[PDB]
Design a protein around this ligand. Sequence first.
Ligand SMILES: [Zn+2]
Ligand SMILES: [Zn+2]
Lengths: 135, 135
Amino acid sequence: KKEKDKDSKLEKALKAQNDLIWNIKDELKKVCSTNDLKELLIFNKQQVPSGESAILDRVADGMVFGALLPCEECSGQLVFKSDAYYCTGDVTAWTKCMVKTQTPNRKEWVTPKEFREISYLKKLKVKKQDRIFPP
Amino acid sequence: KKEKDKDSKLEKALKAQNDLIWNIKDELKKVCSTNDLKELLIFNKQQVPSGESAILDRVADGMVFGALLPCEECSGQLVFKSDAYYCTGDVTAWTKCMVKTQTPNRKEWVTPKEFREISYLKKLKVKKQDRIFPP
Ligand SMILES: [Zn+2]
Ligand SMILES: [Zn+2]
């Protein structure tokens, strides 16, 4: 009964959350190259996936939700899937970690000063020149 | 003879310079409000003109050409006109400064750290939230 109501409230909050992620991705693409995004993952101790889209996705997620901590069981990298985060690590050379959670451990995402200023650096900072006047 | 050639070389350099100014204005409008631009003028010891367009114009000029120093004769504010910079100061309560130059004294324009990061602050920095999963 009110289960439906609760679901709808959640759906609305999820739409807002996904809108935010879309905006963060749209803004990162304006100022960061794939190289810049890899550096951001590396700095926050996240694995760098293959594929330019996956790199962008994991940076924007990190900036919205915080940096994922390594798996507490195997120290592998947790990855978002539609229904939960899943560890991708190896317990042994012959056994995969099965860790899965909707509430993974986080720490705050850190954006270093050089990246905080990256739009200014790329778009506004120029070497001083002399004014030229029309003949 | 070669006067025409020299003029054309200069015209081409001037077009490049004005293109740059246009781009700097276009980028500032994306990240700075009129308030932000007034703060930038004030920080670099420039008078704040009336009119939102004039404020934008003087910040972009400052970022391309450097901060104008006060008039060495009367300490007034130099202002760009089409043919030269002209001092707008008062020598006495009854006499205007007549200083005019195409090569006014400058110092480097400074953009404080908070403004260097202003795009990140406005567009990328969010308070951490919890991931929501679909029901
Ligand atoms: Zn694990
Ligand atoms: Zn003067």
